[PDB]
């Protein structure tokens, strides 16, 4: 009931840029293995145990941030259901540490080598240290997404990555069948150490704000070709395809003649002998037939795509000089004809795109049949190992293979042009594309002439301008009345709509934004030249009401970087003297001693209370009667209207129920059972007209941030940590997850719109540790068992398809105590159900604001050489004070209270009470207060 404070460390994370995974028809390998060694560790630096964990991570969900986050902060590997780690004593997953009976049983130390192996066929991650295997293994985890090696660490630790054989050498031999991680590097990119995700970067001029980064998916490695052999083109196959085959034979033999290749009646590659050595290909030859399959397949693919085949002036092709001779041909060969159709008709851009897609399809089909054979991808070719470095999709292929597969198709397309072909060419992810940066709301200005600058390092989609303090993180910049912004990617001024203005920018050009609150004007200057409107007005916007104030704001698209210069140093301000200096405009934050703190829209979904003014949803608190318990009903305001939105809804209750520390076993209702029971009841009623197949009823853990709009019961996170003895037989097997629900369609399958409402009850036991489900008084086959010291929130996921959807009923059954006793200590023995004001329904929200730290960890990474591999080191301490919310089991920065005006007031009154209780010489309580607020916190 009171916010906690403590000092924590900053923990960062580094990956090796190797993404692996599996799917149906993928070209990747299902077994991997890598090595990390430790050089320097300084324990207990800055009065806190040094963080150091090595393991794997998932691209989809593992997105740590420099702030506090879940738990008490300092999240690393294993503090989420998307990563699994190993610190020396325990295996980390889901922020739970389970000790492992390793041979060494000691924390990570200098001169320690850790080998990690991953199996995707049967999902399993195993670790070993200095050749000694650990007893515990992770199993049965979700295979969605791609896996990459990862290390999390605080300051004062130096490590080296033995990635395969090219970069470092393995201290111990890999287990059989486990490929080194150096083999999974894509042909387009080289090996490079990098952080997982970031919203800023160090640059020459200063910090560069970066936006979202595009990431590959596990389904991007599969080939998806088009069945072109089904389509047949007899009118071309009769004559046109043999004309194409004739010229292909011409070019083929031209290649041999240009090469050292000699003429010989029998094929002798040793003496370079030409098996045919005839100018006109002998048609009965099965090789000539296979060239007929050449032409046939090419025409079939052309017709299968959007191309329209046809003949236009083939007599013109016959009329031009087709028999172009170089007089260098071998005396066995005849006059090799060169049509030279390029001079008559060059390849159009559309034509070269057609060549590109034809080559892409031709490579995709081959990749598909190689996958059918059972080949895989490797950085080094190994024919006996069924590894090919060229079976990646055509998009992932390098340009050398592209041109090698493109040259012959370019010649064929030139022949087609010469013959005269008439071929003619034919919710959650939204937040992951745009990141918004803005200044703190304490810097709002309501008067004067202010100026700041922005630099577009990468030509792309960014929007720079001024915004209101109320500006929401979900909405795009300028889509509402809360932002006057300029988009230089297309040259559009944006405020409650988009209108053309100015011109698009380039890379490296600086745009200066100037606001004049005396004249109510906004001016955008590109490289010192004022951008011009179509009408002929220098002001982008005018007649602007001051209102509550304005703040600088900028938004960046995917893979974009930008340099924002508020103007703390005038010497670093460009074009300010050109425009703004003599016009009475001052740089933003000119006399400020410290740099301006900025806020960014973090994309981590979290549960927030349902606002009372929400236009689409309304929650009613219905009281209890003689035969009905208290209940919270959900309704749709805008149902059955043109301007209505229907989507998946994730709702929970604001208060949790916590299990016992130790599981010590354990009509007219009998009082001994009433005051000796431990089970609790909680029901959900789905109204008539709402499909039972679109509701999920159960419980959730405090760590649930999955906002997938196509939620299925098979998309929930789940892992099993298995601890075995030395002999290998497992003695422990613990399941971990974050969502224990059932599906309403299961009860309705056994049996359109039904009149009867569906009541589903969830029985919980806080002593045994199990929860069961019942439907309409009928026992179900679904049971769940959980570990002690676990707190769960009741929750429902619903797809609204009716005016009235769901009702949270909070009552009691026979010999069963209601949820009020479980939630509240003061009512622990009250059989009468009740709903105090604290109990409330909360909805999942995708985006929220967050505060960027003032200082960041300085991590230095390089490569020592092939003997030592890549090296990572960090040695600068960095701490922060965290504020912890007890019930939600999550913390936040103490400096974030500058905008949270309610928690700040509550904490100030808490401090006042702290002084009051120990006031007037109560030393016995002053001593006790030290365990809550300590000397280090006070000095900090």
């Amino acid at each position, epitope marked *: 009931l009171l916010l906690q404070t403590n000092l924590i460390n900053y923990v960062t994370s580094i990956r090796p840029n190797i993404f692996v995974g599996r799917a149906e028809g993928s070209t990747q390998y299902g077994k991997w293995y890598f090595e990390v060694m430790v050089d320097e560790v300084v324990p207990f630096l800055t009065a806190q145990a040094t963080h150091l964990r090595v393991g794997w991570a998932l691209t989809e969900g593992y997105s740590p941030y420099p702030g506090g986050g879940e738990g008490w902060g300092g999240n690393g590997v294993g503090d989420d259901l998307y990563s699994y780690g190993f610190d020396g004593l325990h295996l980390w997953t889901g922020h739970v540490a389970r000790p492992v009976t390793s041979p060494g049983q000691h924390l990570l130390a200098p001169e320690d080598v850790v080998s990690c192996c991953l199996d995707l066929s049967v999902p399993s991650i195993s670790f070993r240290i200095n050749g000694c295997p650990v007893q515990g293994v992770f199993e049965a985890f979700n295979l969605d997404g791609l896996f990459f090696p990862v290390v999390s660490f605080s300051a004062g630790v130096k490590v080296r990555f033995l990635l395969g054989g090219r970069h470092g050498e393995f201290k111990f031999l890999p287990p059989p069948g486990y490929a080194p991680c150096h083999e999974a590097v894509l042909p387009r990119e080289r090996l490079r150490l990098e952080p997982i995700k970031e919203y800023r970067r160090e640059g020459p001029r200063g910090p560069h704000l970066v936006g979202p980064s595009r990431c590959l998916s596990h389904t991007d490695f599969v080939p998806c070709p088009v069945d072109t052999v089904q389509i047949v083109l007899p009118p071309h196959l009769e004559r046109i395809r043999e004309k194409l085959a004739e010229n292909i034979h011409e070019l083929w033999a031209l290649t041999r003649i240009e090469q050292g290749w000699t003429y010989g009646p029998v094929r002798d590659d040793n003496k370079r002998l030409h098996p045919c050595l005839v100018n006109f290909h002998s048609l009965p030859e*099965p*090789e000539r037939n296979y060239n007929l399959q050449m032409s046939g397949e090419t025409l079939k693919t052309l017709l299968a795509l959007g191309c329209h085949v046809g003949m236009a002036d083939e007599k013109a092709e016959d009329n031009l000089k087709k028999t172009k001779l170089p007089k260098t041909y071998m005396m066995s060969n005849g006059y090799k004809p060169a049509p030279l159709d390029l001079s008559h008709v060059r390849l159009t851009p559309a034509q070269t795109t057609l060549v590109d897609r034809l080559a892409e399809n031709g*490579h995709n089909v081959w990749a598909r049949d190689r996958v059918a054979q059972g080949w895989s991808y490797s950085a080094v070719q190994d024919i006996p190992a069924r590894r090919n470095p060229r079976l990646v999709p055509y998009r992932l292929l390098d340009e050398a293979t592209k041109r090698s*597969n493109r040259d012959s198709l370019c010649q064929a397309v030139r022949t087609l042009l010469g013959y005269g072909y008439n071929i003619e060419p034919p919710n959650q992810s939204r937040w992951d594309r745009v990141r918004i940066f803005r200044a703190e709301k304490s810097y709002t200005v309501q008067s004067g002439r202010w100026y700041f600058e922005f630099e577009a390092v990468t030509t792309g989609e960014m929007r720079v301008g001024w915004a209101r303090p109320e500006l929401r993180p979900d909405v795009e910049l300028g889509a509402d009345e809360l932002a006057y912004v300029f988009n230089g990617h297309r040259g559009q001024r944006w405020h409650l709509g988009s209108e053309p203005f100015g011109r698009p920018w380039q890379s490296g050009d600086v745009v200066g934004c100037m606001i004049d609150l005396t004249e109510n004007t906004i001016i955008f200057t590109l490289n010192g030249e004022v951008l011009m409107s179509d009408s002929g007005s220098e002001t982008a916007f005018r007649e602007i009401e001051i209102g509550d104030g304005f703040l600088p704001v900028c938004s960046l698209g995917p893979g974009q970087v930008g340099h924002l210069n508020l103007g703390q140093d005038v010497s670093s301000l460009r074009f300010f003297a050109i425009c703004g200096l003599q016009e009475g405009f001052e740089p933003f934050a000119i006399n400020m001693q410290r740099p301006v703190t900025t806020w960014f829209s973090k994309s981590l979904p979290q549960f927030e209370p349902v606002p009372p003014e929400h236009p689409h949803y309304e929650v009613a608190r219905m009281d209890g009667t003689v035969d009905t318990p208290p209940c919270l009903r959900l309704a749709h305001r805008t149902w059955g209207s043109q301007n209505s939105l229907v989507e998946m809804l994730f709702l929970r209750l604001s208060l949790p129920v916590q299990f016992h520390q130790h599981f010590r076993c354990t009509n007219r209702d009998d009082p001994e059972i009433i005051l000796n029971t431990t089970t609790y009841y909680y029901s959900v009623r789905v109204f008539a007209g709402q499909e039972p197949s679109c509701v999920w009823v159960g419980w959730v853990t405090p760590d649930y941030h999955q906002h997938d709009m196509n939620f299925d019961l098979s998309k929930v996170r789940a892992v099993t940590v298995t601890m075995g003895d030395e002999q290998g037989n497992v003695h422990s097997s613990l399941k971990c997850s974050n969502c224990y629900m059932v599906w309403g369609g299961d009860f309705v399958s056994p049996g359109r719109i039904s009149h009867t409402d569906l009541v589903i009850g969830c029985l919980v036991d806080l002593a045994t540790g199990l929860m069961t489900f019942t439907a309409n008084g009928k026992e179900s086959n679904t049971f769940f068992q959980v570990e002690p010291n676990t707190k769960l929130f009741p929750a429902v996921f619903v797809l609204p398809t009716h005016q009235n959807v769901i009702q949270f009923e909070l009552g009691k059954q026979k010999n069963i105590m209601p949820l009020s006793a479980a939630m509240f200590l003061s009512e622990r023995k009250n059989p009468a159900p009740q709903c105090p004001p604290r109990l409330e329904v909360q909805m999942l929200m995708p985006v929220s604001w967050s505060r960027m730290p003032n200082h960041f960890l300085q991590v230095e990474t390089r490569r020592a050489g092939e003997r030592l591999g890549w090296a990572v080191q960090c040695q600068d301490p960095l701490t922060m004070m965290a504020l912890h919310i007890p019930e939600e089991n999550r913390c936040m920065d103490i400096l974030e209270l500058s905008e949270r005006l309610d928690l700040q007031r509550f904490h100030s009154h808490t401090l006042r009470l702290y002084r009051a209780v120990c006031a007037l010489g109560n030393n016995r309580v002053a001593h006790a207060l030290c365990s809550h607020v300590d000397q280090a916190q006070l000095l900090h």
Partner: nanobody
Amino acid sequence: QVQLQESGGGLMQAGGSLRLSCTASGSIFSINSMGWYRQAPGKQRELVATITSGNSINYADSVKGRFTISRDNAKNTVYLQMNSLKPEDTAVYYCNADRVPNGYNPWGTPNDEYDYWGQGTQVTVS
């Protein structure tokens, strides 16, 4: 998917006769020039004489001795007979078939990579 099952190349003394039967089972398209590769243990891989549809054989430097290679395209079978065993002829022998005919490809890299490498056998000379 076309699989080449090859059986033969038994271990006998020098001068013996070895019969190797290779059968390609799979798709009906692109079955030409199905031939033989050899690889000595710890040595480079070489190409043995490869027969093509129409009874055309492409020879190399390792065809020395008494070789005879015949094929039937009705069942995609090859009956390779060796009568000259040499101590340097001990190797793993693989039977490989592909769309490429007479060791030529008018496409380039794609069809070159377009090979159907089946299982192989062991050839040992005392």
